[PDB]
């Protein structure tokens, strides 16, 4: 249902989410500024950080890939099958399904009933509004502040040069006057131990945004406009989409880089009701923050199930040992 | 501080006027993480003294000045206490930086 | 008068100003976003009477109810206890709301993100009832996001501690009314969320020429009759 | 069919994927940074490496070699026969087949039907704007972390210099003013234990990216634009391209170096469906992580089939004790 | 310990000019001392050349070489005995191998 994951992962020799370099021969990896202490000093460092849009798109890719296998996977947009997802605009008021069925955008109920990507990842309909926020949100991917403190110097950014040799019809080659394609470009590859954090509010899947409950027989029952079976199928697909993310299937340059991936540690909390996100993994003291926040949440009367991988998080808290992210997903799909 | 004299000798292995082009020793001394490989790399750099002497003598320009034995023991006398690699990297890269200066040797 | 005091630890946030192409991120969160942040907590936590047919209508009802119990429309403010910086990202934020360009047009779009380790934001509540005060304590937590969805903000702590009338230099933000009455930063932050108004606020962050990026600092304006304490350190807060 | 391979390879005296050009003296090998423990906090070290582009190109070479002999070998680009990886560069609209027939880069269906290299390895057509993501993905060849920690940095690099004996017809070795080229040049040769990881997505072969399914019978029937026999043959061609891969044909300077290969250990998984990516062999604890991933994926409801060479894995799950790489690819092609 | 310089001064005579005894192999073998056995063997080969240099220095008008004292040999034997770790052994060997090449003023 409502799940929140935060942790640290090791990935090196990667060029995920670069600046494209569509007009320049040099392709620069993404960078961002970060402030950190330097033993009584607020120093600033330029470190690579994967944007949350990349993670959102790749989670969407995993979800649409896992939703095709299920028998209820017909309810998808034609854009979803192509890993599109612009999701309409000011000029479109008609949705085309996977089989090519016209769907009107009059209300969010029909949109989420006939489409699955629009239900989980939201959409926008400028014609009549009907805005639905994304149920899954992700943060940036920064190296942990402990790593930044402990490296101080060093670049951990390598500009590796690649050529595109184009032999002519017999054996010849040209640079810029024969019309051939022979160039010498560069790519930036980064390393380090990064931090990730995602929040999945899957408890609202299949429920219209405007009507969380129906409240007709004097009971506040959820307003599930869809069948429970494929609502559960959507939940399972969204939860399984996490598997092809913490394995190396995030970012860009996947064909030539495929980052050397290894999840280091993580904490996840799952509950059937609204719950707060714990803390990002970029902070050095995020484990103690997780412990304090879960203790405080349980003090207020919240039913939380906590899973930990490569982290103690104290002994008082009844936490579940996790062998790998797939063990976490298998434990999650129990609900 | 016994860096210029060894720095110019290190540069003697890179200057274009001496066409031998030994960049591996400079890379090795620059990329040193602890004591043993740094000492090994500086030993390899210092081992090429007869080659440089007999190449400069056959050319005409004044012979290179090998580091004097008075500053040799300073290397170990300072680097024995450098257990922490963070302080070691300072001189490990300073020597390489000095090795890439102009250092006009043969007029 | 039980004043809410919550601390948010977030990597970045991207609430911006009105501009084409570039979306210049606010230096500090606007009060409208801050009040909507817990209006979401109101609508989710107890939707028995604060949830309506329309999400916009329910949100507006929550905003009206929450502002009825504030001392002033210009009540909530943040405290830059950590330094602030601004970075920019060129993302594929496709523009398809403007006339034309159908639905398959995607172009480079530059968005500005503000980085600061933690902030302390205080909501001013006036004689709120205890039975609803427990629910409001719960709603102080679970402030998931501020503005853009990718601005994940996790509230590490939240409490109700009275100012007990101390004298301290100003640390939390304040409107540009008491500051003039007694290193100048003035902004407009749209006190109330716009639905289908604008006031002037002081900003207590100054420039420091410490590195290549200029980043932000503290100004500590003159003494204020009221102050609030956190873990033994006193800070200045103003209330009309 | 989706298959993932990850393991370690012993490799010494290899000048693979150098930096400098042929005419420039002191050709230097590529270097890359990696993060390790060294019994304390994280530290970054610079080690020789082989880029993923080199591995992908040699996979392309092997696939072309093994697809030429098939009866459908005519369906190939003329550049593929030259081992030219420039697929539809900037400023062209049509391409040439292997037999000389022209093909128009207007739609992806005909491109993937008539051209096999552009289908398995993907392509880009900026002039028209067409796209196809490569089905094969490769990682860097990085020395494994425990080996780096175990050698405390003897640089793993030897700069060996050597020369040509270009001499005049009269027997005189002239200077630069004569026209001779008797000069010394240095090549850097590396050594050590490396790790590799390549993933194949051969389940989408012969299927256009735009329209994976056609829904003829209201059910997700894949949009196979080519004959099933051609798709199958492409599949075992891509699978057999691994035989020259893990034998010493994934490097440069093969004429004078020919890297000394011996596969130490590896694991391969295939389940003709969506599969999690394995853990790269660079990490010292990748065996346990792969064992856990395989066990949890199998328990979750995935039909993973696992072949292991020179690793004990779990000793309780069904893993096939393969003896070499070509036996592994034989087992892979027996399950098509 | 003070004997490293003493033995390096002697090792300098195997490489320096005005001596025509270009024994680079023994110096490299001492520098490449993987184990204590071959380190001691290389030191023995370096020491065997003592009479040759001792006589040739006075045969060409140079001060007699400073052959290491038996105390230096005793200290070296103790260090070899108590060092069974290649980590320390490599740097120990390099320490006295580095002194061979220097600007020694053997012949004034």
For testing contact with chain D, the best of B13, B18, B21 (most D CBs within 10 A): B21
**Distance of alpha carbon D56 from the chain centroid:** 4
Do the Cβ atoms of A69 and D273 come within 8 Å? Answer: yes
Q: With the C-alpha atoms ordered B64, B68, B71, B77, is the resulting torsion angle positive or negative? A: positive
Q: Which of residues 13-42 of C touch A (CB under 8 A)?
A: none
Whole-angstrom Cα distance, residue A86 to residue D80? 36
Chain D residues in contact with A158 by the CB 8 A cut-off are 31-33
Our separate counts of H helices and E strands in chain C read 4, 13
| Residues pairing with C160 in the sheet | C4
Dmax (CA) for chain A in angstroms is 83
Do the Cβ atoms of D153 and B34 come within 8 Å? Answer: yes
Do the Cβ atoms of D300 and A181 come within 8 Å? Answer: no
Q: How many CB atoms lie within 10 A of CB D37?
A: 12
Question: Which residues are within 8 A (CB) of D116 and not within 5 positions of it... i.e. 6 or more apart?
Answer: D67, D72, D75, D76, D80, D234
CA angle, D152 then D154 then D157, to 5°: 140
Chain C residues in contact with A276 by the CB 8 A cut-off are 141-144, 154-155
CA angle, C183 then C187 then C188, to 5°: 165
List the one residue out of A122, A107, A295, A117 whose CA is nearest residue A211: A107
Q: Resolution in A for the shown PDB structure?
A: 3.1
Do the Cβ atoms of C92 and A134 come within 8 Å? Answer: no
Do the Cβ atoms of B40 and E104 come within 8 Å? Answer: no
Strand pairing of D43-48 and D305-309? unpaired
| C130 phi/psi in degrees, rounded to 5 | -65, -40
Q: Which of residues 222-281 of A touch C (CB under 8 A)?
A: 274-280
Structure tokens that stand for A236 in this block: 């399972």
Looking at CA atoms only, how far is residue E76 from chain B in angstroms?
Answer: 18
| Residues pairing with A261 in the sheet | A11
Looking at chain D, which residue has its C-alpha nearest residue B20?
A: D184
Chain C residues in contact with A267 by the CB 8 A cut-off are none
Chain E residues in contact with B53 by the CB 8 A cut-off are 17
Nearest CB partner across the interface for D157, out of B22, B24, B85: B24
Establish how many alpha carbons lie within 13 A of residue D299's alpha carbon, considering only the half-sphere containing its beta carbon.
Answer: 16
Helix, strand, coil in percent for chain E, rounding step 5: 65, 0, 35
Q: Of all helices (H) and strands (E), which one includes residue E47?
A: helix E36-48
Looking at CA atoms only, how far is residue D154 from chain B in angstroms?
Answer: 6
Establish how many alpha carbons lie within 13 A of residue A46's alpha carbon, considering only the half-sphere containing its beta carbon.
Answer: 11
Residue with tokens 């199998």: D298
Question: Which residues are within 8 A (CB) of B79 and not within 5 positions of it... i.e. 6 or more apart?
Answer: B35, B38, B39, B88, B91
Nearest CB partner across the interface for E94, out of B39, B49, B67: B39
Structure tokens that stand for D145 in this block: 């972390």
HEC assignment per residue over chain D? CCEEEEEEEEEEEECCCECCCCCCCCECECEEEEEECCCCCCEEEEEECECHHHHHHHHHHHHHHHHHCCCCCCCCEHHHHCCCCCCCCCCCCEEEECCCCEEECCCHHHHHHHCCHHHHCCEEECCCCEEECCCEEECCEEECHHHHHHHCCCCCEEEEEEECCCCCCCCCCCCCCCCCCCCEEEEEEEEEEEEEEEEECHHHCCCCCCCCECCCCCCCCECCCCCHHHHHHHHHHHHHCHHHHCCCCCCCCCCCCCCEEEEEEEEEEECCCCCCCCCCCCCCCHHHHHHHHHHHHHHHCCCCEEEEECCCCCCCCCEEECCCHHHHHHHHHCCC
Structure tokens that stand for A118 in this block: 């629009």
List the one residue out of A42, A49, A30 whose CA is nearest residue A196: A49
List the one residue out of D329, D322, D189, D307 whose CA is nearest residue D246: D329
Q: Cα torsion at C103, A29, D24, B41 (round to 10°)?
A: -160
Helices (H), C46-165: 47-50, 55-68, 130-140
Looking at CA atoms only, how far is residue B22 from chain D in angstroms?
Answer: 9
Whole-angstrom Cα distance, residue E32 to residue E93? 8
Q: Are D309 and D324 in contact (CB under 8 A)?
A: yes
Q: With the C-alpha atoms ordered A41, A46, A49, A52, is the resulting torsion angle positive or negative? A: positive
Whole-angstrom Cα distance, residue C187 to residue C200? 6
Whole-angstrom Cα distance, residue A105 to residue A77? 13
Strand pairing of C118-123 and A183-190? unpaired
How many CB pairs below 8 Å do chains B and E form together?
47
Chain C contact present for A24, CB below 8 A: no
What is the full DSSP assignment across C201-236?
EE----B--SSSS--B-----SEES-EEEETTEEEE
Q: Are C236 and C225 in contact (CB under 8 A)?
A: no
Question: Which residues are within 8 A (CB) of D172 and not within 5 positions of it... i.e. 6 or more apart?
Answer: D178
How many CB pairs below 8 Å do chains A and D form together?
151
Angle of helix E36-48 relative to helix E70-82, nearest 10 degrees, comes to 160
Whole-angstrom Cα distance, residue C198 to residue C73? 11
Looking at chain D, which residue has its C-alpha nearest residue B85?
A: D43
State the DSSP code for E37.
Answer: H
List the one residue out of E20, E19, E30 whose CA is nearest residue E99: E30
Q: Are A130 and A140 in contact (CB under 8 A)?
A: no
Looking at CA atoms only, how far is residue D192 from chain B in angstroms?
Answer: 17
How many residues are given for chain C? Answer: 240
Structure tokens that stand for C56 in this block: 């916009």
> Long-range pairs for A173-182 at CB < 8 Å and ≥24 separation?
A179/D91, A180/D89, A181/D86, A181/D89, A181/D90, A181/D91
For testing contact with chain B, the best of D153, D154, D184 (most B CBs within 10 A): D153
- Asked whether A and E share 3 or more beta-carbon pairs under 8 angstroms, the answer is no
Q: Are D141 and D196 in contact (CB under 8 A)?
A: yes
List the one residue out of C176, C167, C157, C184 whose CA is nearest residue C224: C167
Whole-angstrom Cα distance, residue A328 to residue D273? 21
CA distances in angstroms from A22 to A26, A140, A159, A185, D126, listed in the order given: 9, 24, 17, 11, 11
Question: Which residues are within 8 A (CB) of A1 and not within 5 positions of it... i.e. 6 or more apart?
Answer: A202, A203, A235, A270, A271, A272, A273, A335
Looking at CA atoms only, how far is residue B28 from chain D in angstroms?
Answer: 7
How many residues are given for chain B? Answer: 107
Technique behind this structure? cryo-EM
Breaks (C-N over 2.5 A) in chain A follow: none
State the DSSP code for E63.
Answer: P
Structure tokens that stand for C109 in this block: 């779009």
Chain B residues in contact with D188 by the CB 8 A cut-off are 24
| Residues pairing with C55 in the sheet | none
Strand pairing of C109-115 and C85-91? antiparallel
Structure tokens that stand for A120 in this block: 């989980």
Structure tokens that stand for B44 in this block: 């390899």
State the DSSP code for C105.
Answer: -
Q: Are A235 and A202 in contact (CB under 8 A)?
A: yes
Looking at CA atoms only, how far is residue E18 from chain B in angstroms?
Answer: 12
Burial (CB < 10 A; 0-12, 13-18, 19+), residue A298, is middle
Residue with tokens 């004078």: D256
Q: Are C113 and C132 in contact (CB under 8 A)?
A: no
Q: Are D181 and D165 in contact (CB under 8 A)?
A: no
Whole-angstrom Cα distance, residue E57 to residue C14? 81
Establish how many alpha carbons lie within 13 A of residue C33's alpha carbon, considering only the half-sphere containing its beta carbon.
Answer: 22
State the DSSP code for C73.
Answer: S
Looking at CA atoms only, how far is residue D31 from chain B in angstroms?
Answer: 12
Q: With the C-alpha atoms ordered D112, D115, D121, D127, is the resulting torsion angle positive or negative? A: negative
Burial state string for B67-105 with b = 16 or more CB within 10 A and e = fewer than 16? bebeebbebbeebeebeeeeebbebbeebbebbeeebeb
Establish how many alpha carbons lie within 13 A of residue E7's alpha carbon, considering only the half-sphere containing its beta carbon.
Answer: 26
List the one residue out of A12, A120, A20, A115 whose CA is nearest residue A62: A120
Whole-angstrom Cα distance, residue C106 to residue D264? 47
Burial state string for A235-273 with b = 16 or more CB within 10 A and e = fewer than 16? bbbbbbbbbbbbbbbbbbbbbbbbbbbbbbbbbbbbbee
**Radius of gyration of the CA atoms of chain D, in A:** 23
List the one residue out of C119, C115, D186 whose CA is nearest residue A34: C115
Termini Cα distance of chain E: 28
Nearest CB partner across the interface for A150, out of D32, D42, D139: D42
Whole-angstrom Cα distance, residue A190 to residue E96? 41
Q: How many CB atoms lie within 10 A of CB C53?
A: 10
Q: Of all helices (H) and strands (E), which one includes residue E75?
A: helix E70-82
Burial (CB < 10 A; 0-12, 13-18, 19+), residue A84, is middle
List the one residue out of B93, B53, B95 whose CA is nearest residue B74: B95
3-class SS at B11? helix
HEC assignment per residue over chain A? CEEEEEEEEEEECECCCECCCCCCCEECECCEEEEEECCCCEEEEEECCECHHHHHHHHHHHHHHHHHHCCCCCCCEHHHHCCCCCCCECCECEEEECCCCEEECCCHHHHHHHCCHHHHHCEEECCCEEEECCCEEECCEEECHHHHHHHCCCCCEEEEEEEECCCCCCCCCCCCCCCCCCEEEEEEEECCEEEEEEEEEHHHCCCCCCCCECCCCCCCCECCCCCHHHHHHHHHHHHHCCCCCCCCCCCCCCCCCCCEEEEEEEEEEEECCCCCCCCCCCCCCHHHHHHHHHHHHHHCCCCCEEEEECCCCCCCCCEEECCCHHHHHHHHCCC
Q: How many CB atoms lie within 10 A of CB D251?
A: 21
Structure tokens that stand for A219 in this block: 């009971």
Question: Which residues are within 8 A (CB) of A216 and not within 5 positions of it... i.e. 6 or more apart?
Answer: none
Chain C contact present for A174, CB below 8 A: no
Looking at CA atoms only, how far is residue D25 from chain B in angstroms?
Answer: 9
**Distance of alpha carbon D298 from the chain centroid:** 27
Q: Of all helices (H) and strands (E), which one includes residue E24?
A: helix E24-31
Q: Are B102 and B37 in contact (CB under 8 A)?
A: no
Burial state string for C139-157 with b = 16 or more CB within 10 A and e = fewer than 16? bbbbbbbbbbbbbbbbbbb
């Amino acid at each position: 249902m409502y799940v929140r994951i935060s942790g640290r992962i090791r990935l090196n020799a990667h060029s995920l989410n670069a600046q494209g370099g569509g007009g320049t021969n040099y392709i620069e990896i993404t960078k961002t500024k970060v402030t950190v202490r330097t033993e009584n000093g607020w120093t600033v460092v330029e470190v690579p950080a994967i944007t949350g849009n990349m993670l959102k798109h790749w989670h969407f890719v995993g979800f649409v890939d896992y939703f095709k296998t299920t028998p209820y996977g017909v309810n998808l947009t034609e854009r979803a099958l192509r890993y599109n997802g612009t999701r309409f605009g000011q000029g479109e008021t008609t949705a085309t399904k996977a089989n090519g069925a016209t769907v009107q955008l009059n209300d969010e109920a029909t949109i989420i009933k006939e489409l699955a990507d629009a239900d989980v990842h939201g959409f926008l309909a400028p014609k009549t509004g009907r805005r639905r926020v994304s149920l899954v949100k992700a943060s940036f991917i920064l190296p942990t502040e402990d790593f930044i403190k402990e490296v101080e110097g060093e670049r951990l950014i390598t500009a590796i040069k690649h050529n595109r040799v184009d032999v002519d019809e017999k054996g010849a080659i040209g640079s810029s006057k024969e019309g051939t394609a022979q160039m010498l470009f560069s790519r930036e590859y980064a390393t380090g131990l990064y931090g990730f954090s995602i929040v999945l509010d899957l408890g609202l899947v299949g429920i219209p945004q405007g009507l969380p409950v129906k409240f007709e027989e004097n009971q506040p029952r959820p307003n599930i406009v869809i069948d429970p079976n494929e609502r559960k199928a959507r939940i399972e697909s969204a939860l399984k989409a996490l598997i092809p993310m913490l394995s190396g299937y995030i970012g860009a340059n996947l064909a030539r880089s495929f980052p050397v991936f290894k999840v280091e540690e993580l904490v996840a909390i799952a509950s059937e009701g609204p719950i707060p996100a714990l803390v990002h993994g970029f902070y050095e003291d995020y484990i103690e923050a997780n412990r304090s926040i879960i203790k405080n949440a349980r003090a207020l009367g919240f039913n939380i199930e906590v899973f930990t991988y490569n982290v103690d998080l104290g002994e008082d808290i009844e936490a579940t040992k996790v062998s790998s992210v797939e063990e976490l997903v298998a434990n999650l799909v129990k609900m | 501080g016994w860096i210029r004299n060894i720095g110019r000798y290190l540069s003697y292995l890179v200057d274009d006027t001496f066409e031998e082009y030994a960049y591996d020793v400079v890379d090795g001394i620059a990329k040193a993480r602890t004591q043993e490989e740094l000492l090994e790399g500086v030993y390899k750099a210092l081992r090429l003294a007869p080659k440089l002497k007999k190449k400069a003598e056959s050319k005409g320009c004044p012979p290179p000045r090998i580091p004097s034995p008075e500053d040799i023991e300073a290397l170990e006398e300072k680097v024995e206490q450098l257990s922490n690699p963070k302080d070691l990297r300072k001189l490990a890269v300073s020597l390489a930086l000095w090795a890439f200066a102009s250092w006009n040797n043969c007029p | 008068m039980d004043i809410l005091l919550v601390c948010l630890r977030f990597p970045f946030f991207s609430v911006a100003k009105r501009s084409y192409q570039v979306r210049t991120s606010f230096l500090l969160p606007p009060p409208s976003a801050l009040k909507g942040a817990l209006a979401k907590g109101l609508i989710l936590l107890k939707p028995e009477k604060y949830a309506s047919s329309s999400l916009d209508e329910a949100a507006l009802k929550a905003i009206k109810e929450i502002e009825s119990k504030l001392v002033d429309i210009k009540a909530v403010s943040v405290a830059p206890l950590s330094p602030l910086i601004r970075n920019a990202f060129l993302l594929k934020r496709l523009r398809n709301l403007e006339s034309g360009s159908n639905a398959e047009k995607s172009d480079a779009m530059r968005r500005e993100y503000t980085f600061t380790r933690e902030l302390l934001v205080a909501y001013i509540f006036k004689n709120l009832t205890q039975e609803e005060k427990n629910l409001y304590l719960k709603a102080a937590m679970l402030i998931d996001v501020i503005g853009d969805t990718e601005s994940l903000a996790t509230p590490v702590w939240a409490s109700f501690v009275k100012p007990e009338d101390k004298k301290a230099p100003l640390a939390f933000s304040a409107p540009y009314t008491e500051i003039y009455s007694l290193r100048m930063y003035i902004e407009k932050m749209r006190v109330s969320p716009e639905y289908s108004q604008e006031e002037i606020f002081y900003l207590p962050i100054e420039e420091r020429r410490y590195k290549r990026i200029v980043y932000y600092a503290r100004i500590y304006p003159p003494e204020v009759e009221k102050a609030l304490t956190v873990d033994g350190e006193v800070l200045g807060i103003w209330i009309p």
